Every structure is written in C-alpha cells, then in structure tokens.
Write an enzyme that holds these catalytic residues in place. Structure first.
Site, short mmCIF file in Angstrom:
data_model
loop_
_atom_site.label_atom_id
_atom_site.label_comp_id
_atom_site.label_asym_id
_atom_site.label_seq_id
_atom_site.Cartn_x
_atom_site.Cartn_y
_atom_site.Cartn_z
N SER B 1 1.13 -1.15 0.19
CA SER B 1 -0.30 0.18 0.03
C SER B 1 1.19 1.49 0.13
O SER B 1 1.53 1.36 0.59
CB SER B 1 -0.90 -0.08 1.02
OG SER B 1 -1.76 -0.90 1.01
N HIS B 23 -2.59 -1.76 -1.24
CA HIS B 23 -2.48 -3.50 -1.48
C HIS B 23 -3.28 -4.33 -1.11
O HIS B 23 -2.70 -4.65 0.15
CB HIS B 23 -1.16 -2.99 -2.10
CG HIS B 23 -0.64 -2.25 -3.33
ND1 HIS B 23 0.21 -1.36 -2.32
CD2 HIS B 23 -0.92 -1.52 -4.19
CE1 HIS B 23 0.77 0.07 -3.15
NE2 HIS B 23 0.17 -0.39 -4.45
N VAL B 70 -0.35 -0.81 6.01
CA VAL B 70 -0.49 -1.68 7.04
C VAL B 70 1.43 -1.37 7.44
O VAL B 70 1.85 -1.17 6.39
CB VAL B 70 -0.48 -3.51 6.80
CG1 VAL B 70 0.42 -4.02 7.14
CG2 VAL B 70 -1.35 -3.37 6.80
N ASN B 244 4.76 1.13 3.31
CA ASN B 244 5.61 0.36 4.08
C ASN B 244 6.48 -0.09 4.78
O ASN B 244 7.16 -1.05 5.51
CB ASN B 244 4.53 -1.50 3.15
CG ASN B 244 2.95 -1.35 2.77
OD1 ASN B 244 2.78 -1.66 1.58
ND2 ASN B 244 2.78 -1.73 3.82
N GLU B 455 -3.51 -2.66 -6.94
CA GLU B 455 -4.25 -1.75 -7.31
C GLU B 455 -5.33 -2.41 -6.88
O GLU B 455 -5.68 -3.44 -7.53
CB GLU B 455 -3.80 -1.33 -8.50
CG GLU B 455 -2.60 -0.35 -9.18
CD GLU B 455 -2.06 0.55 -7.31
OE1 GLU B 455 -2.58 2.06 -7.87
OE2 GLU B 455 -1.71 0.75 -6.80
#
Lengths: 160, 522
Positions: B1, B23, B70, B244, B455
C-alpha cells in the site's frame, strides 16, 4: 477563512446508485444511513459477508464443514465470538443503534431479495449488531495483529 | 500500500492533496474493498472499506480524509512454554493451566452435524496452542479490552477538526496501521498507529519470535499511548508518506530517528525500492496540481535495474554465450519502465528473482548496502558480477520456459482479466521499484499472468472548495454472481482513466441509474 460548501440535508431515505454500482446512501439520521449501508453491502457482497459473519460466530465448521474447521478452532480458542458479545454490549448506546441498523439493513436486503442469497449462507441469517462487531474483531485482532500462521508456525496467505 | 499527503505550500492552488492506495489480494474475501457514500444531515463520508465493516476506513468528505497502510504493529506475543508435570514452568515453580471444556459442531458430508469436543487451555500469558512439531505456544494479544475500534474510525472520519481527529485517534481502539490524514484547513499528519505493549527489554525481532514463557520477566501488562508513537504533522518538507517502509523516512527532511523510540515498535530494515520512489516522487516535485499528483501515482520504474544494470551489462557482454550477449543488449536498450510494450522487462524480472530472491527483497547481491544516511539511493551495484552473469544465464532459460521467448512484450504476458474483459498490463512488482503495484501471478501454460494483489481502491483528493477527487476500483464494486459490476472498471484501469468521484447531490442526481427507497423502523 472560506467555509466549505453547504451540507446536504436529506429529507428522505434512499440509495441513489450510479452506473458502476456505487451506492450513495442518504439517511434522515445516522441509523437510517447505516441501515442503507448494510442493505447496499448485502446487495453488492452479500454472500461473502454472510459467510464471514458465520465464521466470526464460531460457526464455520458447523455451517460448512472441515474446510472451515481450523478457523473455528482458532476463533473459539481465542474467545472471539463471546468477546464480540461483550464488546457489543460495551458500545455506547448511540453507536450500538448504528450497528443494529447496519445488521437490520443486511437482514432486510436478504428478506426482500432471497433469490440473491446463496443457499449455503441462508442459515446464517438473521445477523446482529454483535455479528458485525465480531467480524471486525476477528479482522483487526485475529487476522491483522495475531494471525493463526504466526502462532501455529505455518505459512502466509494466498498469492502466487 | 501507498499513502501520500501534501501540504498546501507544496501545491500550486494551495489545497492539500491525499492519495488512498491500499494493496491487498484481489481474491481473499475479507480483504475485498467496497466503495460507498453515506450522507445524513450531520455527516458525510465517501470511500472504501473491507466488506462487512460498517465504517469506511478509506474515507474523505468536503473537510478531510484519511488513508491506511499496514505497519505490522507487534500487538501480540507468542510464548514458548516449558511443560512439566501436567503444567508449565513459570518463575521456578510448576503452574497448572486454566482449562475449559468447550465444543463445536462439524458439518458432515450427508448434511448432518456431529458434536466435537475442544479443550481450551490458558496459561497466564493467554490461550495455548500446540504446533505440529510439538511446541506449546501461548498467545498474548494486546488490546482485547478495546471495544471501540469501529466507533473510533467513525469519529476520526467525521471529525470537525484535526484536534477532534487526534482526540479520537488517541483512544487507542484501532490496534494497528499507519494512518495518514489531510484536510481543507491545510493540516497533514502521519501516525504509526496501534496498540503496542510496553516492554523493558528486547528489540522488535526478539518480540516477533518465540519469547520465553517461563518467567514474569517477559509478561507485559500495559501499552503505549499515542504520543509515544512515531508521528509527523505539517513537516518542513510539506508532505508525508508511507509505502509499508519502517516509519523512519515518512517525510524529507526527517523529523525524528530510530533512537527516539523503543526498539520494539518497528524494524530498521532496508526500505523497499518502491518506498524509496515514494519519497523521491513527493520530495523532488513542487507546485503540485492534482493532475500531476495523479500522473506521479502511475510511476512504474524498474528502479532495481537502475541499481544493477550499469554493472551487469558490461559483465554480461564479456560472456562467450551469444544469447547472454543478446540478453545484455536487450536489457541495455530498455528504458527501465514496466510498460506494456517492454520487451526486456520479463527477462529482467527473472534475473532479479535470482539476484534478489523470489520476493526481490534480498540484499546480499548488492555492492553497496542500504543505509539510512542515503535512504533513497542505496543499496547499489552488483557485488559479484561473474556470479550475476551466471544468474542471467539461468534467467534466460527461465524466461524462455515461462513466456516462450526472452523478448515477449510485457503487456502480452501480463494481462488483467475479469469475466470477459482482457486488457494489457503495465506496472508491476513493488520490490523492483514500481510505485503503482501489480503483483503478477506465475504464468499459465501459455505464459499469461494476472494480478494476484496490488492496486485495488485508488483515489486522489484535492481539498479545494468544493473538493475534487478521482478514483478506480480494480475489481469493481460487486462480486455477487451475475453482477455487471465486477469487470466494468478494469479496462479503465488499463488506461488509468479515473472516475470523477461524485459527492455533491447534483452530481449524484445526474449520474443515478437506480434508486432504492428504504425505511428503517426499529
């Protein structure tokens, strides 16, 4: 200091869906908007929502047999379904009513469109506010934070 | 992400910009995102969230928005127990388990259930599991007394101001995630959020492994408040980001360093080449418009080719194998972008799988190691070019076997296919440097592959008045059988042809194709 544009004040409850199937849910109050949102999600992702809520109840093995059994053992051993009932009761009154409304919206979608709900997940209905709290609990704490794989010493989830 | 927020001073029009860009798997049911718009007299929220969640995690409205990635907040501990005399050793003495006889039903092939017993044992640490290899592990999850996760998100995304946002965030009911915020008043914020146990020793790797379960030395009981966690608000560089990466370059110049926090919150590992690009794309550009912001989101650079091809190519051209020499010339002529028409990209991926491992995160092949002092320009170089040329020889063979040739067009092997829509792919693996991510599957028998992950929901919002926002959902807004709304956006994704997100009532009324009156009688 320029102010934002005037907020819309809904006078009726309605979902205006666009051409890509995006719901614009207008509610005269919070519970109405949450109900609309539950209805919409059931329309768009109903089967898999019911399946997940079933699992977060601890009932995956019971509803769907062996392929769901190890998740059931993980979630029951970690007290997830009962803790969700506790967390549901521990909600503020106002937010609990939004959660109840969301669940009512799901139930109402399924009730008015039973043909759209796959046979295998019908046994899950009706869903409750506590079911909604429970899936959120499983997702955050027992998928994201504490996964079965890390504790049990297994592998990582589906890609390749 | 990925996640970007840009302050007014770094933009041309003076309005903050936000990118939402998670993601996740395109198939895993509980990771499926859904887009929606909720409006009442007292609030409005637009955006995406995982199915079954009654609040929108990726939300924005006319005043503000957030996004998430995350962070891996280590909110649980797995403890190795020492079993002895029907109990477990703890502080010198044998201690008996709490034990509870539960049961559950299991569906049978004939549609009946049988009742199956389940013992639930706990130590002081928590519930006890046995691994196949016989290890007794007790798992201790933090934040089991935080019932307000959903309401916290709800109050965060309907906050009247940044101060109200922070106060909600500060409840610590959301146990993980990096969270990025922006608003029309001009504030941007990055928070490494979660519920993290307070511990008096041990770095993050110690607390990610099996921690000794035989002593109160390692039995934590409290957790950190929000102001103990890495955070950045309105920094001098005029942006924040996270892709991330560990939270040590959330902006540039930085505002803190690893020493400023306990060593168990986040790793101090090399930042992915995608994360390095995140930082460069924001830092090196000024006077951003929404249009330019969006163009930058599509970045799909083979950054690892930038770091390795200068050394690899001349080494490879020394090799007597004419096919290796030809592989080297093909790679040398490539513009190092993952485009549909690239003839070299697939071969480069196969080389990188060996050079940097199957996940492309390996560091041992590089000549110059990653360093936080040069966080967007290391690691660099090929340590052992002769070995790397041998890897290329193998990669040539792998490429031919998978795809039929060393120069098949990237977008001919890489396809996005949903129902009967089949369109050319571009961009790719994050760890190779692609900011826009499509984690291509292994190819089928014909060399065709599709995204397993990458995506999903993508939106870019300018907090002008009124707001202006664009987005797409790779896999549509519905996954129910027979829906016309599963494959109806992927062609647009293949061209980066984003939908205008419609928040104003007049726009919604113009676009309406179906109306569902409802009413709720409690």
């Amino acid at each position: 200091p320029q102010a934002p544009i005037a907020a819309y004040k809904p006078r009726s409850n309605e979902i205006l869906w666009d051409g890509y199937g995006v719901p614009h849910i207008y509610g005269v109050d919070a519970p109405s908007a949450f109900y609309g949102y539950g209805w919409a999600q059931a329309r768009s992702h109903g089967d898999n929502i019911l399946r997940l809520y079933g699992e977060a109840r601890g009932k995956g093995a019971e509803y769907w047999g062996p392929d769901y059994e190890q998740t059931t053992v993980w979630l029951l051993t970690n007290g997830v379904p009962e803790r969700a009932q506790q967390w549901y009761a521990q909600q503020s009154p106002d937010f609990r009513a939004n959660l109840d409304a969301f669940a009512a919206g799901i139930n109402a979608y399924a009730q008015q469109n039973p043909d759209d709900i796959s046979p295998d997940v019908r046994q899950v209905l009706p869903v409750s506010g506590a079911d909604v709290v429970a899936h959120a609990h499983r997702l955050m704490n027992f998928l994201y934070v504490a996964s079965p794989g890390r504790t049990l010493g297994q592998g990582d989830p589906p890609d390749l | 992400s990925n996640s970007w927020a840009v302050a007014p001073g770094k933009t041309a029009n003076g309005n903050a910009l936000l990118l939402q860009n998670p993601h996740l798997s395109w198939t895993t049911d509980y990771f499926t995102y859904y887009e929606a718009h909720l409006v009442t007299p007292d609030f409005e929220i637009y955006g995406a969230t995982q199915i079954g969640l009654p609040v929108i995690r990726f939300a924005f409205n006319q005043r503000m928005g957030i996004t998430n990635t995350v962070n891996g907040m280590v909110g649980a501990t797995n403890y190795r127990l020492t079993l002895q005399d029907g109990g477990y050793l703890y502080d010198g003495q044998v201690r008996p388990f709490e034990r509870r006889q539960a049961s559950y039903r299991l569906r049978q092939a004939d549609g009946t259930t049988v009742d199956k017993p389940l013992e639930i044992r706990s130590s002081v640490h928590g519930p006890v599991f046995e691994r196949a290899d016989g290890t007794a592990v007790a798992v201790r999850v933090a934040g089991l007394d935080r019932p307000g996760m959903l309401e916290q998100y709800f109050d965060m995304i309907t906050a009247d101001s940044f101060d109200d946002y922070e106060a909600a965030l500060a409840r610590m009911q959301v146990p993980t995630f990096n969270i990025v915020y922006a608003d029309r008043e001009g504030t941007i914020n990055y928070s490494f959020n979660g519920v993290a146990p307070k511990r008096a020793e041990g770095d993050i790797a110690f607390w990610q492994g099996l921690v000794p379960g035989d002593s109160s030395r390692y039995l934590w009981t409290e957790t950190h408040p929000l102001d103990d966690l890495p955070r950045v608000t309105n920094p001098p560089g005029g942006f924040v980001q996270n892709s991330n990466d560990p939270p040590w370059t959330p902006t540039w110049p930085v505002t803190y360093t690893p020493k400023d926090f306990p060593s168990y919150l986040a790793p101090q590992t090399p930042h992915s080449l995608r994360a390095q690009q995140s930082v460069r794309l924001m830092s090196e550009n000024d006077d951003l418009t929404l249009e330019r912001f969006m163009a930058l989101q599509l970045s799909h650079r083979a950054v690892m080719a930038d770091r390795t091809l200068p050394d690899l190519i001349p080494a490879a051209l020394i090799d007597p194998d004419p096919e290796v020499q030809a592989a080297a010339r093909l790679l040398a002529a490539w513009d190092r972008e993952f485009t549909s028409d690239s003839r070299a990209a697939l071969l480069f991926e196969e080389w990188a799988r060996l050079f940097a491992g199957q996940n492309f995160a390996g560091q041992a092949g590089f000549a110059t190691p990653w360093s936080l002092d040069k966080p967007v320009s290391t690691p660099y170089g090929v340590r052992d070019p002769k070995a790397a040329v041998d890897q290329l020889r193998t990669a040539i063979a792998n490429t031919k076997r998978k795809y039929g040739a060393i120069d098949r067009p990237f977008g001919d092997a890489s396809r996005m296919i949903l129902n009967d829509v089949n369109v050319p792919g571009a961009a790719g693996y994050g760890n190779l440097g692609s900011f826009r991510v499509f984690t291509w599957s292994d190819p089928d028998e014909n060399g065709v592959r599709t995204p397993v992950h990458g995506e999903t929901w993508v939106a870019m919002i300018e907090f002008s008045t009124p707001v202006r926002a664009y987005g797409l959902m790779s896999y549509g807004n519905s996954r129910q059988p027979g829906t016309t709304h599963y494959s109806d956006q992927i062609e647009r994704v293949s061209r980066a042809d984003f939908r205008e997100l419609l928040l104003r009532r007049e726009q919604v009324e113009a676009a309406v194709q179906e109306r569902t009156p409802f009413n709720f009688k409690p």
